[PDB]
Design a protein around this ligand. Structure first.
Ligand SMILES: Nc1ncnc2c1ncn2[C@@H]1O[C@H](COP(=O)(O)OP(=O)(O)O)[C@@H](O)[C@H]1O
Ligand code: BEF
Ligand SMILES: [Mg+2]
Ligand SMILES: [Zn+2]
Ligand SMILES: [Zn+2]
Lengths: 208, 411, 119, 98, 132, 67
């Protein structure tokens, strides 16, 4: 059973730390110079926050076409430089006059307008507003809106104190299982079953 | 025009109709063009043939609407097509009165654009626009079918009313006192229909082939066979085998839209060569992001944290009163058992002396809100609340949106 | 859970973390790393454990069982579902419930007139 | 463990009721026990209960018909405060009795 | 028949309160300890004298464990850790218990029937005392 | 000698080490002040008393009993 007497080396043994350990066998080496220099020169951190919000905004989009334009809007909202976050974070027009006339013909089936026009400054402003073709970004960086108003609209509505109240929940990354949780050796992803591990290995084990 | 018109500007769907009419006229707010370039109107989107590759364009951005010409075209189509909508017909709207619903935190620039457009282009005699939250305290003016859920248990308008909504765009938490929302304590959540639809698309693409190019089919699947966990995530997961559903994808040759097949029932025995996709885990996993964002690998706080923060910002004198009157609005709340689970979860974190009460309308909540602002228009307080055209002409365009309909006035 | 263990690391308390411990159990089909939350760290440090030997860990009981050295071979999934059946006579139950440590009297024979209300 | 199924539903401590007096002689003397029996703090809880129930009955006869009512206390800053005060004083009187 | 009141629920937080006045009669002691309890029906906070605090400290309970407080005798027993923290670690020796029903504090009575011989046996064979 | 104690004061800092502290004992009909020796302080340190308590002291052996 238990050994009452154990050989102990004074300078080697330390109760603070307990460590035990056991085609060509070669470890994995990252050959990316950018990653190597990043490692050399350097509750979640800002990198995880940026990745999470970028993924959230990419998923919030409804069309593939608007995906490349999403990071610019995200950087404008967050205030971080656009190109820097685009390069450092790896992800994962609307109007046409001919289309305008096509929709005119589309709803020309039934219409009851009452045309009447007078040359006034208010009518000029109406024409300018109606024919705008301005993106939400154009309104956002416009100087018309006060900085305090933007801060109230964006940085004030979000909560600040209660980061989390309900307990954390972690499940299998493939099927959502929870009774058996096992982190992957290489990429640190939580895995549960045999099929889930096999499916993770070749597809989602990017760091492998 | 004694009876005013009721219009609900929604990012997903537009609810419009006269105050006399009991139900609003449903109309989408988006323009869909196929891969070949053929564009179809919002109401004609359901009448299209191919749903494989569709590009969606709508004036409503994540915050507000910026492209006013498309919104004006949609409004002209919805307001001046008597053939399209039975009975309804608007000739000029000069003497008509309009009550509109807008985003509670609309930008002042877009707000003044809306005011100018509605006042001049449509020549409306009188108008009263406000967020949907303001209209809710007026439900006491009428007797209607209202359901109530108690978390602890296993003039006409009311001052104390906490209004929470989950629209297609996002989710807002609004405390309202004396009929005036407390904008300082207003909390918002980015969870919306877009988030759920995209998450369902990604999960299906992981568990099956890639359908992120398809959005109408995924939206129909979410609106048909999605439900929240009745008790907890673990309880649903353990019984997920029993709670299994199979969806038959539509075949363009035969059926434009598919249908959900439940293994328990045998009333659909006809075979079909088309493949069927089974859904077990995704039935309740997607709605669980409201309470446990960690499942979707996001760092957002959650609904309960937002509610607690909003209550904390509110004065302590009215904090217990707010939770006694809670009403749920929006299309996201049509998911079954969501309200009871929300009430239980919020009551769990509340102190014992405070009792949680939740009120929820039956059927679609958008129609409930439309009827709510219709009833508000029927109220005598609306007559004093509405603004005349002559007053708007006398004042500057910015004065109305900075004093009467502006949140900055109530800040 | 059971299988050949290949890596075990244990660290002392720091302000960042009270106790961080990672162990790697490899089977014929699987090899993954679990996170040790203090108590199992103490249990594993209670008895000397060396990598490369077959051990069994009971999550519910929290006890450590060593099945030998790698003499045997793993089989598959680390965690599995099984039930343990125990055959116990009525007399043994009475003796167990009749004393502070009754199961010792099963062998020493000093039960001594178990009370009737116990039966 | 299987036999340790919940017993507090149908068990009595039997020491709170002074039925295990055989060990009282180890630390207690006769005169101290007699004095502690004579010096009971009774009739003080009764006084506190009366002094609280006076205001309780005042608040009752004032507004208790609609105070504890859920409908009246749903939206009222004053009726709700009255109801919560009544609940609080009831809780204190019950705790004092215990 | 006897009536007992029990405080039970998950431990949200516990806070010792030390008075700054030595008062001459003692060197260092906690004036009181504030503990908040959570259950399905609601949450409640409590204020405890140093004896109960010493008992619960001996019970070795941190934040996140379901406990059991008896008002009559001051008995404190640790039921176990709440199941909400099951996924905190990959493996854990501690068992997990679902969150109890009832708000925090319950009132109940026991009508257990016991013959006099059991009383005599208990009186003759006491079970108390921690002495060796 | 049985009676509720009003307050106990000991000069642990002015002199230190049984500086002859004093405590006041009150009854419903009478109340006086007593002078306490070193052994009194040593005995009272065990079974600490924070005033406002009813205690009885033995005249012969000086035994502290908390009623
Ligand atoms: N039957 C249904 N089941 C589940 N979800 C639904 C159902 N009907 C609508 N929804 C969801 O409700 C949302 C509609 O939100 P809506 O109230 O239209 O917001 P807005 O008024 O801002 O347009 C859509 O995103 C849709 O996903
Ligand atoms: F703005 Be929402 F979708 F109600
Ligand atoms: Mg809406
Ligand atoms: Zn899995
Ligand atoms: Zn991996």
């Amino acid at each position: 059973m238990k050994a009452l007497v154990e050989e102990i080396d004074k300078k080697t043994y330390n109760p603070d730390i307990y460590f035990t350990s056991l085609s060509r066998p070669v470890k994995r080496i990252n050959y990316s110079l950018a990653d190597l220099e990043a490692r050399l020169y350097t509750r979640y951190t800002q990198q995880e926050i940026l990745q999470s919000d970028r993924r959230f905004m990419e998923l919030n989009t409804e069309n593939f076409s608007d995906l490349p334009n999403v990071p610019t809007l995200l950087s404008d909202l967050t205030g971080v430089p656009r190109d820097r976050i685009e390069s450092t974070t790896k992800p994962i027009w609307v109007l046409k006059p001919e289309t305008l006339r096509e929709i005119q013909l589309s709803y020309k089936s039934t219409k009851l307008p009452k045309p009447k026009r007078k040359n006034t400054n208010r009518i000029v402003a109406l024409k300018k507003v109606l024919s705008s073709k301005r993106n939400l970004h154009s309104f956002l960086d416009s100087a018309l809106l006060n900085l305090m108003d933007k801060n109230v609209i964006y940085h004030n509505v979000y909560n600040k104190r209660y980061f989390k109240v309900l307990p954390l929940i972690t499940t299998c990354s493939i099927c959502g299982g929870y009774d058996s949780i096992s982190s992957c050796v290489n990429c640190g992803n939580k895995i549960c079953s045999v099929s889930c591990f096999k499916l993770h290995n070749e597809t989602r084990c990017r760091n492998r | 025009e004694t009876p005013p018109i009721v219009i609900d500007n929604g990012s997903y769907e537009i609810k419009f109709g006269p105050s006399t009419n009991k139900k609003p006229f449903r109309a989408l707010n988006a323009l869909a063009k196929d891969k070949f370039g053929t564009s179809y109107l919002s109401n004609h989107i359901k009448n299209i043939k191919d749903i494989s590759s569709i590009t969606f364009r709508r004036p409503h951005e994540l915050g507000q609407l910026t492209l006013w010409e498309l919104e004006s075209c949609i409004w002209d189509y919805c307001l001046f097509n008597p053939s399209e909508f039975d009975g309804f017909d608007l000739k000029e709207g000069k003497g008509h009165h309009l009550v509109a619903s807008e985003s509670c935190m609309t930008l002042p620039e877009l707000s003044k654009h809306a005011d100018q457009v509605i006042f001049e282009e449509y020549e409306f005699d009188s108008l009263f626009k406000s967020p949907v939250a303001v209209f809710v305290p007026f439900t006491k003016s009428y007797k209607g079918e209202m359901r109530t859920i108690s978390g602890k248990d296993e003039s006409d308008y009311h001052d104390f009313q906490l209004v929470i909504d989950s629209g297609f765009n996002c989710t807002w938490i609004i405390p309202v006192l004396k009929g005036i929302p407390y904008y300082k304590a207003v909390k918002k959540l980015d969870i919306g229909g877009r988030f759920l639809t995209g998450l369902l698309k990604e999960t299906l693409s992981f568990r099956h082939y890639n359908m992120m190019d398809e959005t109408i089919l995924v939206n129909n699947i979410k609106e048909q066979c999605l439900f929240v966990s009745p008790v907890s995530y673990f309880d649903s997961f353990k019984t997920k085998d029993k709670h299994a559903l199979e969806y038959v994808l539509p075949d363009f040759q035969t059926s434009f839209l598919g249908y959900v097949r439940n293994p328990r029932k045998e009333n659909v025995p006809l075979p079909e060569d088309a493949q069927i996709i089974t859904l077990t885990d995704e039935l309740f996993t997607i709605p669980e992001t409201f309470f446990h964002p960690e499942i979707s690998q996001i760092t957002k706080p959650g609904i309960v944290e937002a509610i607690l923060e909003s209550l904390s910002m509110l004065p302590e004198i009215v904090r217990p009163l707010m939770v006694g009157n809670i009403v749920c609005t929006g299309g996201n709340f049509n998911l079954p058992n969501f309200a009871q689970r929300l009430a239980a979860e919020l009551q769990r974190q509340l102190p014992t002396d405070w009792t949680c009460h939740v009120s929820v309308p039956e059927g679609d909540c958008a129609l409930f809100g439309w009827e709510v602002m219709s009833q508000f228009a029927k109220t005598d307080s609306y007559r004093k609340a509405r603004v005349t055209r002559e007053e708007y002409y006398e004042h500057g365009p910015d004065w109305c949106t900075k004093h009467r309909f502006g949140y900055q006035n109530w800040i | 859970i059971e299988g050949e263990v290949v890596e075990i690391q244990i660290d002392r308390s720091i302000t960042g973390g009270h106790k961080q411990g990672k162990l790697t159990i490899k089977t014929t089909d699987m090899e993954t790393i679990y996170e040790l939350g203090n108590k199992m760290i103490d249990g594993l440090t209670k008895e000397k454990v060396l990598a490369g030997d077959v051990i069994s860990i009971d999550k519910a009981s929290g006890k450590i069982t060593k099945l030998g050295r790698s003499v045997q071979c793993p089989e598959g999934e680390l965690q599995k579902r099984k039930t343990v059946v125990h055959t116990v006579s009525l007399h043994e139950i009475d003796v167990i419930n009749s004393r502070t440590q009754g199961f010792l009297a099963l062998f020493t024979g000093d039960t001594g007139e178990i009370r009737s209300e116990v039966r | 463990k299987l036999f340790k199924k919940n017993n507090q539903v149908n068990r009595v401590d039997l020491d709170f009721l002074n039925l295990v007096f055989t060990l009282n002689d180890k630390d207690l003397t006769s005169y101290h026990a007699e004095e502690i029996s004579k010096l009971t703090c009774v009739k003080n809880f009764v006084e506190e209960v009366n002094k609280l129930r006076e205001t309780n009955k005042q608040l009752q006869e004032e507004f208790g018909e609609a105070s504890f009512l859920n409908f009246q206390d749903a939206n009222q800053y004053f009726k709700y405060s009255n109801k919560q005060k009544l609940e609080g004083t009831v809780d204190m009187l019950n705790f004092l009795k215990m | 028949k006897e009536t007992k009141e029990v405080y039970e629920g998950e431990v949200t937080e516990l806070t010792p309160e030390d008075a700054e006045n030595p008062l001459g009669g003692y060197g260092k002691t906690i004036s009181h300890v504030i503990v908040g309890l959570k259950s399905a029906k609601g949450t409640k906070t409590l204020r405890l004298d140093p004896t109960i605090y010493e008992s619960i400290q001996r019970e070795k309970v941190s934040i996140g464990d379901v406990i059991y407080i008896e008002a009559n005798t001051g008995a404190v027993k640790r039921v176990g850790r709440s199941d909400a923290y099951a996924t905190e670690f990959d493996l854990e020796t501690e068992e997990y218990v679902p969150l109890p029903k009832g708000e925090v504090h319950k009132k109940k009575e026991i009508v257990q029937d016991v013959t006099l011989h059991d009383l005599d046996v208990a009186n003759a064979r006491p079970q108390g005392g921690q002495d060796v």
